[PDB]
């Protein structure tokens, strides 16, 4: 696997967003400012709670199929390769890592089989879209920590995706959970959300390396990044962390991440988190405390590193 110079796009999208000129302008700027060669198109269906069984990919929160295909085609017209990442959020705000059901099927209770039926039907539809648009890679799940123990069901889902899509298939585990997944043999690429502290890369990379060596598969950090916020460099996954604006802390985080991972031949790339569809005005970048790097010192750090690889 070539080194993946990637950037996540579309997380903020809602139905209709991908029809707009400003979505195209934002993607053009993502490529120009970062020298990314892959875009990770990250989308989120909705379910009501962490313990309900219906996965909705048709409502106002989700781009329509026609505009999604339009955006994917436009990305390819720019020379980008495309990784499609359809995941799921909860309407009550619970992180999807907590999605979970009783081990047993209890009368009148929601079951694992019910949830997986709805989630499989969701994944198969977007796998067909990934096939039609020739996406380079497809991500069947994201940070589903408590669901990862249902090995048999994840294998069933992956086999369903294989019937619809001929490209590379991966699953995105959460930080520290790279060994929690036992179905890596059924996938083409291992990936995780590499939200590791600025001062702990050595221990975490050594741990992941040993996991990755157990399988014969390439690896990359399909999500990674850090807000421009004081304190974020120690807990970069924490999107709701409280702290003052700090552009330099974000740049320092990226500098260390790239320096530490560059010497690991098995770290095969990044899907940096994240580049918004409705991008803030560049004049507001020095006051933006979010993950975005547009107009911030980390933008130049990323572009320089991607151009070196």
Ligand X SMILES: OC[C@H]1O[C@@H](O[C@H]2[C@H](O)[C@H](O)[C@H](O)O[C@@H]2CO)[C@@H](O)[C@@H](O)[C@@H]1O
Which residues are at the interface with ligand X (CB under 6 A)? 11, 89, 143, 193, 223, 237, 239, 273
- d(CA 150, CA 134) in angstroms, rounded, equals 29
Q: Are the CB atoms for 209 and 271 separated by under 8 Å?
A: no
Tell me the closest approach of the beta carbon of residue 309 to ligand X, in angstroms. Answer: 22
Tell me the closest approach of the beta carbon of residue 124 to ligand X, in angstroms. Answer: 22
The DSSP secondary structure of 280-309, one letter per residue, reads PPGGGGGG--SS--TTSHHHHHHHHHHHH-
Q: CA-based angle 65:239:201, to the nearest 5?
A: 105
Q: Name the residue nearer to ligand X (CB basis): 154 or 273.
A: 273
Q: How many helices (H) does the chain have, and how many strands (E)?
A: 7, 8
Tell me the closest approach of the beta carbon of residue 173 to ligand X, in angstroms. Answer: 10
Tell me the closest approach of the beta carbon of residue 152 to ligand X, in angstroms. Answer: 25
Tell me the closest approach of the beta carbon of residue 239 to ligand X, in angstroms. Answer: 4
Q: Are the CB atoms for 277 and 12 separated by under 8 Å?
A: yes
* Buried b / exposed e along 105-143 (16+ C-beta atoms within 10 A): eeeeebebeebbebbbebbbebbebbbebebebbbbbbb
Q: Name the residue nearer to ligand X (CB basis): 133 or 268.
A: 268
Tell me the closest approach of the beta carbon of residue 96 to ligand X, in angstroms. Answer: 7
Q: Name the residue nearer to ligand X (CB basis): 89 or 111.
A: 89
Q: Name the residue nearer to ligand X (CB basis): 81 or 229.
A: 229
Q: Compute the radius of gyration of the chain from its Cα atoms.
A: 19
Q: Name the residue nearer to ligand X (CB basis): 27 or 223.
A: 223
Q: Name the residue nearer to ligand X (CB basis): 133 or 228.
A: 228
The DSSP secondary structure of 100-144, one letter per residue, reads ---SS--TTS--HHHHHHHHHHHHHHHHHHHHHTT-SEEEEEES-
């Amino acid at each position: 696997m070539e080194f993946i110079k990637g950037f996540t796009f579309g997380w903020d999208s809602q139905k209709g967003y991908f029809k707009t000129e400003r979505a195209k302008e934002s993607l053009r700027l993502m490529q120009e400012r970062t020298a990314s060669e892959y875009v990770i198109v990250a989308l989120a269906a909705l379910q009501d709670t962490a313990h309900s069984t219906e996965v909705d990919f048709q409502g106002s929160h989700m781009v329509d199929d026609d505009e999604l295909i339009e955006l994917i085609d436009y990305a390819k017209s720019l020379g980008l390769k495309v990784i499609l990442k359809p995941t799921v959020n909860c309407r009550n705000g619970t992180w999807r890592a907590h999605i979970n059901f009783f081990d047993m099927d209890i009368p009148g209770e929601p079951t694992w089989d019910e949830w997986f039926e709805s989630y499989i039907n969701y994944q198969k539809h977007y796998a067909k879209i990934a096939e039609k648009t020739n996406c380079e890679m497809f991500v069947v799940g994201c940070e589903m920590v408590q669901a990862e123990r249902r090995e048999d069901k994840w294998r069933e889902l992956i086999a369903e995706v294989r019937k619809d899509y001929r490209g590379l298939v991966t699953y995105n585990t959460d930080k520290y959970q790279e060994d929690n997944v036992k179905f890596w043999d059924a996938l083409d690429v291992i990936s995780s959300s590499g939200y590791y502290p600025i001062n702990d890369w050595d221990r975490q990379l050594d741990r992941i390396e040993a996991v990755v060596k157990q399988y014969d598969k390439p690896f990359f950090f399909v999500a990674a990044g850090c807000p421009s916020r004081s304190g974020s460099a120690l807990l970069p996954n924490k999107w709701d962390l409280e702290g003052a604006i700090n552009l330099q802390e974000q740049a320092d985080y990226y500098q260390v991440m790239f320096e530490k991972t560059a010497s690991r031949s098995w770290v095969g790339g990044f899907g940096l988190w994240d580049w918004q569809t409705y991008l803030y005005d560049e004049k507001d970048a020095t006051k933006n405390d979010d993950y975005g790097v547009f107009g911030k010192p980390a933008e130049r750090v990323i572009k320089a590193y991607y151009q070196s690889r």
